Design a protein around this motif. Structure first.
Motif, PDB file in Angstrom:
ATOM      1  N   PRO A 139      15.561  -1.027   8.188  1.00 17.01           N
ATOM      2  CA  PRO A 139      14.332  -1.245   8.922  1.00 17.01           C
ATOM      3  C   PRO A 139      13.029  -1.036   8.083  1.00 17.01           C
ATOM      4  O   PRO A 139      13.038  -0.387   7.025  1.00 17.01           O
ATOM      5  CB  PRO A 139      14.399  -0.188  10.054  1.00 17.01           C
ATOM      6  N   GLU A 140      11.913  -1.534   8.593  1.00 23.72           N
ATOM      7  CA  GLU A 140      10.659  -1.484   7.887  1.00 23.72           C
ATOM      8  C   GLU A 140      10.307  -0.047   7.512  1.00 23.72           C
ATOM      9  O   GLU A 140       9.956   0.209   6.395  1.00 23.72           O
ATOM     10  CB  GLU A 140       9.555  -2.082   8.755  1.00 23.72           C
ATOM     11  N   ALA A 158       9.724   1.416   3.864  1.00 29.30           N
ATOM     12  CA  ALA A 158       8.448   1.968   3.509  1.00 29.30           C
ATOM     13  C   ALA A 158       8.616   3.339   2.785  1.00 29.30           C
ATOM     14  O   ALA A 158       7.813   3.702   1.849  1.00 29.30           O
ATOM     15  CB  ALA A 158       7.584   2.119   4.741  1.00 29.30           C
ATOM     16  N   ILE A 159       9.610   4.088   3.263  1.00 32.72           N
ATOM     17  CA  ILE A 159       9.888   5.378   2.733  1.00 32.72           C
ATOM     18  C   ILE A 159      10.333   5.229   1.284  1.00 32.72           C
ATOM     19  O   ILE A 159       9.938   6.035   0.456  1.00 32.72           O
ATOM     20  CB  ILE A 159      10.970   6.140   3.543  1.00 32.72           C
ATOM     21  N   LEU A 160      11.175   4.249   1.033  1.00 34.90           N
ATOM     22  CA  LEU A 160      11.673   3.910  -0.313  1.00 34.90           C
ATOM     23  C   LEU A 160      10.611   3.392  -1.280  1.00 34.90           C
ATOM     24  O   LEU A 160      10.658   3.662  -2.496  1.00 34.90           O
ATOM     25  CB  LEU A 160      12.782   2.865  -0.207  1.00 34.90           C
ATOM     26  N   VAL A 175       1.753  -4.364  10.925  1.00 34.31           N
ATOM     27  CA  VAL A 175       1.538  -4.838   9.536  1.00 34.31           C
ATOM     28  C   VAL A 175       2.879  -4.865   8.824  1.00 34.31           C
ATOM     29  O   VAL A 175       3.596  -3.907   8.847  1.00 34.31           O
ATOM     30  CB  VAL A 175       0.586  -3.951   8.705  1.00 34.31           C
ATOM     31  N   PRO A 176       3.244  -5.995   8.239  1.00 33.15           N
ATOM     32  CA  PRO A 176       4.467  -6.004   7.513  1.00 33.15           C
ATOM     33  C   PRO A 176       4.353  -5.299   6.179  1.00 33.15           C
ATOM     34  O   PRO A 176       3.271  -5.301   5.535  1.00 33.15           O
ATOM     35  CB  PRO A 176       4.726  -7.495   7.274  1.00 33.15           C
ATOM     36  N   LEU A 177       5.503  -4.741   5.777  1.00 32.69           N
ATOM     37  CA  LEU A 177       5.711  -4.028   4.545  1.00 32.69           C
ATOM     38  C   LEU A 177       5.456  -4.832   3.266  1.00 32.69           C
ATOM     39  O   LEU A 177       5.081  -4.250   2.224  1.00 32.69           O
ATOM     40  CB  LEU A 177       7.136  -3.425   4.508  1.00 32.69           C
ATOM     41  N   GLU A 178       5.686  -6.152   3.311  1.00 29.95           N
ATOM     42  CA  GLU A 178       5.527  -6.969   2.091  1.00 29.95           C
ATOM     43  C   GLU A 178       4.061  -7.037   1.683  1.00 29.95           C
ATOM     44  O   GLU A 178       3.756  -7.199   0.531  1.00 29.95           O
ATOM     45  CB  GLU A 178       6.040  -8.384   2.284  1.00 29.95           C
TER      46      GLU A 178
END
Length: 513
Positions: free
Chosen positions: A410-411, A415-417, A467-470
């Motif tokens: 998941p997003e 994000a954590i990574l 907001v997407p992670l990309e």
């Protein structure tokens, strides 16, 4: 050193302490380069020698005490500019107290000259020179050993932040010889806030002694421009030297550390002679490592002025080939309070310093946080703890992903990574070879960390807004974050906080919220 055949506990194995020790290279015992070594025993030791300090060198004495002054051991009765870095402080030897009936005038002197006389309360007149002797096996005394508080500031982000050393603490570094121990030990020696370094730098590599005599004299103390030798004293253990002396070098070294401590210096005692320290005919022989380490500490020193000095210990545990299981690995790791685990996989991955942030530890975190909170910042501990939580989170996630793959992540987890990887790359990794990043002052460490954790808070905020992670991963401000360690102006680093916030605002504007 002539000595005498006395009964009791050995010859009375001792060391001389006074001007000119600095820049000098000594053996388990205290004789200059390539000199024969004496045997040991519980009972006694025999030594054929040379002189430890030149009797022939002329030193500029500046008295600091006067006829009439009362004195106690540790009291400082004058000064001798020794190297261009270090003032040597002339101290009444421990156990001597009384009145100064006689003191030398400002002038040049060799060390056998008497520069003062003290009349003890019995009336006994004691004569003091610029040097003194101490039995290497008796801890030089002090008023009080202070609890671990102030950090030994290393300037290395991973150590200072996650695995701190206290002034007066005990640390070990083990792992392969391969990538980075040398450069890391070298970084510690030159950057740590200890005025003086005692290095027990002792032939673990056949060409090590060659490197020592050939290279060490050219190294600069980055704080002054001057040579690192001018605040250093070396103690060689080699394969040709007697098991005897090799045994005794730690004592000689710690004794000399305590002696600079007693003047009010912070001193770093560095041991990188794992293998040469070996013996033949064990519990009986392990409380002999324990009490050596018990001699580390920050102390209020003897003397009439309130005065603090310390000895911090950093011991290498580099076992050759793979002697990593049994000797110097059961008793030593459970006695040291800090452990910086150099890790060959991290080194192969080119992550430097190659310190494993999951197997290292420091038990000085709570001891030093208040020092950080009071001056460096108020959020230092909250911030390390948060950055560690995220590194622990990352490590769990990567295990999981090793088994089940990344495609159903998941997003939030992606994000954590992303942010953990920025921690690893921007902060954990530090470039010893770069003219700015070779040292990271406290103020810079906390600011880089606030930049990183602010980016984390805004990332998790953005995601929980659709907001997407990309889009977050290609915020331009990210790449400036990857370069902040190369920025010397801390205020420019700081501006990244506002810059991050603003780019996020304009990602909020694209999309909703």
């Amino acid at each position: 050193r002539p000595g005498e055949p006395v009964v009791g506990t050995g010859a009375s194995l001792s060391v001389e302490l006074g001007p000119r020790l600095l820049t000098s290279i000594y053996d388990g015992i205290q004789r200059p380069l390539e000199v024969i070594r004496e045997k040991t025993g519980d009972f006694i030791a025999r030594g054929v020698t040379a002189p430890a300090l030149p009797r022939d060198k002329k030193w500029h004495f500046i008295p600091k005490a006067k006829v009439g002054d009362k004195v106690v051991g540790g009291d400082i009765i004058g000064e001798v500019p020794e190297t261009s870095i270090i003032v040597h402080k002339i101290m009444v030897p421990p156990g001597i107290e009384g009145e100064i009936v006689e003191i030398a005038e400002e002038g040049d002197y060799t060390i056998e000259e008497v520069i003062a006389k003290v009349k003890t309360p019995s009336g006994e007149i004691k004569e003091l020179k610029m040097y003194q002797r101490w039995p290497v096996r008796v801890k030089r005394p002090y008023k009080e050993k202070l609890p671990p508080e102030v950090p030994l500031i290393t300037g290395q982000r991973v150590i200072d932040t996650f695995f701190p050393q206290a002034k007066g603490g005990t640390a070990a570094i083990p792992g392969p010889f391969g990538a980075g121990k040398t450069v890391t030990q070298h970084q510690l020696a030159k950057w740590s806030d200890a005025q003086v370094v005692i290095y027990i730098g002792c032939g673990e590599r056949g060409n090590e002694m060659t490197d020592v005599l050939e290279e060490f004299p050219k190294l600069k103390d980055p704080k002054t421009g001057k040579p690192l030798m001018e605040r250093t004293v070396l103690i060689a253990n080699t394969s040709n030297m007697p098991v005897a002396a090799r045994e005794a070098s730690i004592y000689t070294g710690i004794t000399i550390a305590e002696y600079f401590r007693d003047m009010g210096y912070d001193v770093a005692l560095m041991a990188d002679s794992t293998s040469r320290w070996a013996e033949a005919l064990p519990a009986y022989l392990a409380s002999k490592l324990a009490e050596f380490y018990e001699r580390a500490g920050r102390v209020v020193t003897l003397g009439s002025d309130y005065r603090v000095g310390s000895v911090s210990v950093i011991g290498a545990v580099s076992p050759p080939g793979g002697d990593f299981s049994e000797p110097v690995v059961q008793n030593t790791l459970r006695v040291v309070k800090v452990f910086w685990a150099l890790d060959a996989d991290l080194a192969r991955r080119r992550h430097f310093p190659a310190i494993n942030w999951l197997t290292s530890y420091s038990l000085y975190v709570d001891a030093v946080k208040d020092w950080w909170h009071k001056n460096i910042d108020p959020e230092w501990k909250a911030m390390r703890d948060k950055a560690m939580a995220l590194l622990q989170k990352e490590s769990e996630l990567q295990e999981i992903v090793r088994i089940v793959g990344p495609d159903a992540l998941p997003e939030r987890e992606r994000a954590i990574l992303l942010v953990a990887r920025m921690l690893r790359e921007d902060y954990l990794q530090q470039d010893a070879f770069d003219e700015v990043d070779t040292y990271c002052p406290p103020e810079k460490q906390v600011t880089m960390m606030r930049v990183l954790l602010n980016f984390y808070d805004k990332t998790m905020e953005a995601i929980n807004r659709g907001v997407p992670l990309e889009e977050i991963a290609k915020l331009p401000v990210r790449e400036e974050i990857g370069r902040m360690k190369f920025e010397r102006d801390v205020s420019k680093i700081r501006s990244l906080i506002d810059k991050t916030n603003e780019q996020f605002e304009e990602l909020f504007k694209k999309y909703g919220a």
